[PDB]
Design a protein around this ligand. Structure first.
Ligand SMILES: Nc1ncnc2c1ncn2[C@@H]1O[C@H](COP(=O)(O)OP(=O)(O)O)[C@@H](O)[C@H]1O
Ligand SMILES: Nc1ncnc2c1ncn2[C@@H]1O[C@H](COP(=O)(O)OP(=O)(O)O)[C@@H](O)[C@H]1O
Ligand SMILES: Nc1ncnc2c1ncn2[C@@H]1O[C@H](COP(=O)(O)OP(=O)(O)O)[C@@H](O)[C@H]1O
Ligand SMILES: [Mg+2]
Ligand SMILES: [Mg+2]
Ligand SMILES: [Mg+2]
Lengths: 371, 367, 371
């Protein structure tokens, strides 16, 4: 009847119906199991917790992430998360609505093939389609020309599009994302005597990073200010009542996006990646790409990131070139909004991979481009 | 037919049937024998007395305790006490009702193995189970999350439980308990000229401690008040008519719980032990543990103990943390009530260690 | 004149002069005070005992450890231990010899800053340097390439080095060490009816663990053998004449190193940690790291630990990979030997942080990388 849009990013599930203005079920992509000693199921105890269930009881659970760097690694956990999303979060029968899914570019084919097999055999979904997140972000922005930088928990990628035409040769992908930033913050916090080693402690540190971290305009001058002044100090209260104080870490943690060498990787910065992606396109396209820079995803929600990137790109680009950074207040749900818009389109109704098409063509039909 | 619940704490036996609201037989765990000269059994004299029998005739008997620090040391006395409980206190045949027993954590395995062997060979009990006292106390409280401090005659232990899941790494055990407090009171009473050296005198001093001792909110200020004023004096009448007067001893005797160094032990206080047990759990659990502090046992019946411990834990805990101490008026029988509740549950009927299971698996099935 | 090398591990002090073949003063890092009732110092009684002084009189003392998990917590005790080491163990004036110190990686900066402040103000040491223990262990081994696992009383850490270049991103640290093993043995011994609750009893249990514990090649089969046979029983005599018998505890106590869940921690085993550290390095380095596995420290002195770890790593590693475990007979003093070798080098004489450098640059000079 009504198509379902479900964005399966790493660490967060956003699902809803096509035509809606926002996803109606948002919860972490985690599975938790008891860790102290064996659970004896002859009586009233459970062994698995999904989403907010694991978050509420994380003090006695070990938390899983089924998706690593945009690749699903634990498929039983994926099936259980899908079942929970389908029967409790949305409490709707899958067999009567087509489902639209999202994936990162340059992923292995086996991931898409397994997703389609599960979506057609375990659940008898009438039809499905897997799209690229950057295209949906551009759809949500309402533009047809621009280069989109999407950064989440596992993957940061750049996709330039010019007036409805993609540029597959200039698509770049980076493995640095929010999870690596959380790990770096956990490592750095040991300098002040704060130790976080468990998965629940990792969730606490992720909350701290979301709440207190920000992007500095100039890193060295900001570091000098933090070394000579204490105006940058912030306080945070732990769940058990302890209070910790954080200083230059607040802007040191997100600095890894522009300086990947902080965690030992040889890659370039996100601004450098965007400039290299733009330079790989034809010379008659670069001006429009400079004029339309779009970010989306949770990792782009740091305060001051847009100004910093505009400064960096202006430094890289020629002086006569005109540049903005487009950072809407709802960058978090841009992929889902674009997916809903696309699923609501009449021209997309021919793109669905139905039951008989998959049954006859086989698994190879996933990489088809109908358009 | 109906399961039997029997809490074998040190110095007190509480037994009854599952589903009942209170134990129906409560008596001291003591065995007494004549002490003056040899009992010649050719005619009408007895040599052993159990429970209230020894208490009534303690003036001509030497009293035993078969259980020391939660460990059974004299097994023949244990068998005789079990036989008396089974045939005179409850006057019921053991071979037709399953029996639920209790034990302190971190006990030797041989104790449980010997208990099971006696409960299966000497008495042909159809099935049995040995549980932890703190879990039964939490069952009686009706909660699934909390940390329980149980203090009796021999053992004080802490067991934190979060929503039906135990935390074995944070279980702490202390050997300071009511018997040590009685010994300390007996030692301290010599300052005023009162001498108690026999077992019956020890029982008298235990009665005095139960009747007159209390926990002070602030020890030094209370001591200053007792030194400068006589409003804290109390009078007690001995069985032979002598009257004794006791002063600061009334709050000095239970102070050993918070200050173990009074009797020469290196351990920390009960509040310090509880705080250390809470700090050993995961950070996402500590708030609920702070909100649910439960005491049970006879040694927690001193007036003012709950306020003192709440003050101490509030001093130890952060200011934003919310704390109560849960001290029901019937903390004495919490373990037995929880055992009865558990034995009445339908999900517990699969937990019984039956005749053939023990006969085949062997002694290792107890754990 | 001659540089001093002092390895301040938890629970043991090893000090000596550079160029020597072994440390000349080895004693526990403990401070003892009387515990029964107040010491009245108007006449001939003492209140503090250091090292073997506390060990000989531990029956009337409560013993301190100033260092917890490689972090100094009681600084007055640290000053007294340093003074004893400097004036009675070595009976040498500090103000004429430079001192080389050791520290665990990923420690708080305040620890090093306080150590330097005490070493420069309380004692007027001409110069000092703080090194990493794993680097000194590799120096003692004589190699330039390899991954070192150092386990002591408080900290177990892994540091991979390839031909003189460190890999800071692959350094891992674990808090499980010998003290936790002693606590676990004390807890487990209650099953047989043996109770140890005081600090002196803890020292006795530590001696028992050092004397009778060993690492089993296969845990379950060894447990079955111990359950079905009594050939694994051992006898130990207490100081007061009591004799105790210990069975499967002898290999259950050190099993916590490979199974941290025995004490309720979520961490992986030491073999798993080493494999994860190796896998984090570049693919062209892993073969040499597999070929050079070095242990050092007291906690690596259990019999059969090297064979067990080689078996585990061979199980984890591919079949074509070549692996040894390097376990010299003197793993206990490897850090001190490497420190002496480094202090004897001519290229290290430029690394000393002298009086005026610290007076001018300030406390921030401790983390400098001169090299
Ligand atoms: N306000 C914020 N500040 C910093 N980081 C954020 C913020 N909100 C979300 N994040 C980070 O974004 C990451 C991923 O979120 P998102 O990209 O929206 O979903 P997904 O990656 O699952 O598609 C999270 O790991 C989170 O740490
Ligand atoms: N009102 C009271 N005040 C102080 N102490 C008490 C009181 N009632 C009981 N006790 C002490 O509690 C101790 C043990 O009682 P309890 O814990 O109920 O049984 P058990 O230890 O046998 O399981 C006794 O030694 C007694 O001295
Ligand atoms: N032969 C041995 N067997 C088992 N453990 C040992 C042995 N020798 C020393 N240890 C343990 O090693 C721990 C720390 O020793 P070490 O690492 O040499 O010094 P430090 O940790 O002070 O630098 C001690 O707690 C001790 O229990
Ligand atoms: Mg996303
Ligand atoms: Mg009791
Ligand atoms: Mg060491």
């Amino acid at each position: 009847t009504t198509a379902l849009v479900c964005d399966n990013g790493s660490g967060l599930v956003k699902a809803g119906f096509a035509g809606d203005d926002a996803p109606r079920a948002v919860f972490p992509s985690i599975v938790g199991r008891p860790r102290h000693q064996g659970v004896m199921v002859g009586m009233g105890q459970k062994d698995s917790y999904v989403g907010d269930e694991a978050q509420s009881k994380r003090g006695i659970l070990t938390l899983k992430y089924p998706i690593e760097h945009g690749i699903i690694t634990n498929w039983d956990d994926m099936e259980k998360i899908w079942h929970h999303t389908f029967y409790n979060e949305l409490r709707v029968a899958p067999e009567e609505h087509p489902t639209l899914l999202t994936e990162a570019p340059l992923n292995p084919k086996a991931n898409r093939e397994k997703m389609t097999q599960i979506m057609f055999e375990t659940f008898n979904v009438p039809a499905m389609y897997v799209a690229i997140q950057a295209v949906l972000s551009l759809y949500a922005s309402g533009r047809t020309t621009g280069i989109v930088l999407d950064s989440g928990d596992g993957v940061t990628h750049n996709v330039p599009i010019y007036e409805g035409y993609a540029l597959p040769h200039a698509i770049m992908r980076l493995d640095l994302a929010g999870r690596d930033l959380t790990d770096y913050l956990m490592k750095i916090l040991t300098e002040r005597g704060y130790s976080f080693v468990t998965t629940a402690e990792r969730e606490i540190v992720r909350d701290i990073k979301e709440k207190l971290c920000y992007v500095a305009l100039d890193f060295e001058n900001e570091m000098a200010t933090a070394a000579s002044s204490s105006s940058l100090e912030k306080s945070y209260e732990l769940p058990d009542g302890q209070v910790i104080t954080i200083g230059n870490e607040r802007f040191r943690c997100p600095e890894t996006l522009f300086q990947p060498s902080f965690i030992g990787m040889e890659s370039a910065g996100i601004h450098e990646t965007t400039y290299n992606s733009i330079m790989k396109c034809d010379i008659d396209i670069r001006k429009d790409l400079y004029a339309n820079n779009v970010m989306s995803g949770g990792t782009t929600m740091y305060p001051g990131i847009a100004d910093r990137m505009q400064k960096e790109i202006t430094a890289l680009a020629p002086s006569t070139m005109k540049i903005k950074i487009i950072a809407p207040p709802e960058r978090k749900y841009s992929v889902w909004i674009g997916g809903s818009i696309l699923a609501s389109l009449s021209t997309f109704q021919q793109m669905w991979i139905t039951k008989q098409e998959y049954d006859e063509a086989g698994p190879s039909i996933v990489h088809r481009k109908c358009f």
